């Protein structure tokens, strides 16, 4: 078909190719933006929409901004673009050839020999009937977190709280 | 892991009611009194580290230590005997469970068997 989810996976992976190469944190922040929107799109394709919008909100709408603060604290004059060094750009190309070899393996249509077998063909094939009443599986699925899963709520509450305490006990020391 | 995960039994209880039936260690089991002296010497080092006039001082606390370790040493001995008695039991039950794999081998005598002799030279 469109293979649209899969090509999104490809743009995702190159999003990590330009991201995992390390050319000033700001451009890497761009890398996680691209990989971020691609991510939420990909998970949206299975219809877990609420989650894809969590990451598109909580992650990218949160994190990469605070990184857009760290660079204000780090920067250094003349930050490097991807093209600005032989090892960085060499690295980016180094990612591209590999992932392209994977796509060529997709052209081969044979199961992947790397690491462990990748069964091949289109993504749609694994889908099953999504039949349900006037509610998505996800909705009540996460709604369950409160009523039906109090324990996790306890440890997350406690954890985040004392994480705030830790931020205090690091920054105040100075 | 063995023993752990054994059918029946419950996790955190230190000591099964299934024990109890085993005789308790007697009051002056030498292992136990050794727990005594262990506590004793610990009580003594407690003085020596903190200067103190060793031995005569704090004879009080020293008595606390020896009573402490002998006390815990007691129950620890009970669980010891319980555990070993347990593995012995499971072992014998299993040897009845599979008689075939634990053959009652016939015992030929020395007259019956040949064995090579090696002269010392």
């Amino acid at each position: 078909t469109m293979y649209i989810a899969f090509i999104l996976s490809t743009i995702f992976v190159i999003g990590f190719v330009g991201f995992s190469s390390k050319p000033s944190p700001i451009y890497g922040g761009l890398g996680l933006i691209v990989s971020g929107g691609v991510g939420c799109g990909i998970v949206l394709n299975f219809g877990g929409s609420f989650l894809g919008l969590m990451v598109f909100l909580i992650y990218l709408g949160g994190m990469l901004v605070v990184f857009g603060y760290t660079t204000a604290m780090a920067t250094e004059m003349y930050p490097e673009v991807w093209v600005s060094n032989k090892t960085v750009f060499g690295a980016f190309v180094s990612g591209l050839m590999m992932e392209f070899c994977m796509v060529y393996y997709a052209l081969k249509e044979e199961e992947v020999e790397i690491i462990f077998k990748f069964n091949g063909l289109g993504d749609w094939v694994i889908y099953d009937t999504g039949d349900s009443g006037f509610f998505s599986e996800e909705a009540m699925g996460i709604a369950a977190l409160y009523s039906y899963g109090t324990w996790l709520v306890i440890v997350t509450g406690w954890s985040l709280l004392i994480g705030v305490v830790v931020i205090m006990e690091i920054t105040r020391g100075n | 892991t063995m023993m752990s995960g054994r059918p029946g039994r419950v996790p955190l209880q230190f000591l099964p009611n299934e024990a109890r039936s085993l005789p308790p260690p007697k009051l002056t089991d030498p292992r136990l009194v050794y727990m005594g002296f262990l506590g004793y010497c610990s009580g003594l080092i407690d003085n020596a580290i903190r200067r103190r006039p060793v031995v005569s001082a704090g004879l009080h606390r020293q008595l606390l230590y020896v009573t402490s370790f002998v006390f815990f040493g007691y129950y620890l001995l009970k669980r010891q005997d319980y555990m070993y008695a347990l593995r012995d039991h499971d072992m014998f039950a299993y040897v009845k469970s599979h008689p075939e794999d634990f053959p009652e081998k016939d015992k030929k005598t020395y007259g019956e068997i040949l064995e090579e002799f090696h002269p010392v030279r």
């Binding site: 690491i115 462990f116 324990w151 996790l152 440890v155 406690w158 954890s159 004392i162 994480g163 305490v165 830790v166 006990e169 690091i170 105040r172 020391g173 100075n174 | 892991t1 063995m2 023993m3 752990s4 292992r31 050794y34 727990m35 262990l38 010497c41 610990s42 009580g43 080092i45 407690d46 020596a48 580290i49 903190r50 200067r51 230590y65 620890l76 001995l77 669980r79 010891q80 555990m83 070993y84 593995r87």
Partner: protein, 347 residues
């Protein structure tokens, strides 16, 4: 940082490990480590030094990447068996990574390089706690996944931890780095026998913790650090140097002493498995481990390095703030040898 907060941190570390020791679901284990981390970093940052900061940077950076690989390998396990219960793992490519992640969490070689450094960066309080309490949780999960471990992979790190735990121990002066190589060496002995029989592991664990409690309480008691700094102590409070000697020998596992109990059960267990060669190499190298305990003993109690004059006034002043738990931690870590059989209490 006021004690009321410090204690909440340290208690949430205790909780952050207890949680690993309780929960059966994997996600709560990864939460167990994860909560453990956040609560572990700040306590390294008390007093705060330009040095300590990069110490914590090391520790966090490695623990974070370890936890990452771990969660990845969990997810792969789920992908190929749809489970969350601990139990056996069902895909070797995942299993080896869970072994790796835990291998960082113990600090086993060749992942080990962070541990000698981090220890250098913090005070002996935070140090001791790092070398004992942090060693619980990852072992607490390894005991649960002993059933399916790929023994080859485990024994290789288990040995190499002992060689590296040796050679890197002969070289250093300041004690904290040495304590680091001691622990990094004992973990080789714990994680070695793990595929074969976990109860021996937990035994060895208890002895190790008791031991390093003995040492760090002593170093605290004398506030020694660099070897020379330790050397002066023979004249001021002779007893405690005269006791570091012994606890060191119990590290060395000279046979009357308690520290021999681990090795000598381990050698038993592995020998039932045949595998006769491995314990021989292991036991031979443990000697090499002993030798720098001995040299360190020479700096201290057996021989008197020259005293500095200024020491004399210090003679008038008794040490204070006694640490109650100490004497028992010495004695248990030494005299207990004719109480091996009690190990079966651990079933």
């Amino acid at each position: 940082m006021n004690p009321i907060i410090y204690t909440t941190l340290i208690m949430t570390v205790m909780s952050g490990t207890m949680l690993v020791m309780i929960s059966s679901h994997w996600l709560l284990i990864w939460i167990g480590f994860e909560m453990n981390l956040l609560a572990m970093i700040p306590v390294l940052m008390k007093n705060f030094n330009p040095r300590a900061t990069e110490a914590a940077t090391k520790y966090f950076l490695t623990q974070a990447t370890a936890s990452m690989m771990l969660m990845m390998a969990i997810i792969i396990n789920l992908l190929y068996s749809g489970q969350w219960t601990i139990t056996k793992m069902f895909n070797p490519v995942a299993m080896t990574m869970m072994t790796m992640a835990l291998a960082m969490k113990l600090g086993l070689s060749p992942f080990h390089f962070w541990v000698p450094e981090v220890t250098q960066g913090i005070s002996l309080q935070a140090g001791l706690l790092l070398l004992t309490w942090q060693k619980l949780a990852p072992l607490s999960v390894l005991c649960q996944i002993s059933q399916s471990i790929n023994p080859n992979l485990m024994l290789t790190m288990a040995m190499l931890s002992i060689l590296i735990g040796g050679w890197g121990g002969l070289n250093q002066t300041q004690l904290r780095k040495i304590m680091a190589y001691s622990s990094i060496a004992h973990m080789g002995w714990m994680t070695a026998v793990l595929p074969y029989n976990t109860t021996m592991t937990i035994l060895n664990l208890l002895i190790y913790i008791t031991m390093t409690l003995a040492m760090f309480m002593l170093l605290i008691h004398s506030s020694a650090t660099t070897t020379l700094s330790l050397s002066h102590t023979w004249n001021k409070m002779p007893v405690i140097t005269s006791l570091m000697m012994v606890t060191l020998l119990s590290m060395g596992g000279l046979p009357p002493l308690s520290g021999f109990m681990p090795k000598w059960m381990i050698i038993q267990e592995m020998t039932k498995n045949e595998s006769i060669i491995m314990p021989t190499l292991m036991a031979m190298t443990a000697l090499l481990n002993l030798y720098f305990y001995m040299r360190l003993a020479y700096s201290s109690s057996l021989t008197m390095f020259p005293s500095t004059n200024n020491m004399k006034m210090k003679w008038q002043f008794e040490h204070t703030k006694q640490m109650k738990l100490l004497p028992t931690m010495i004695v248990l870590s030494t005299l207990v040898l004719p109480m091996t059989p009690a190990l079966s209490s651990l079933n």
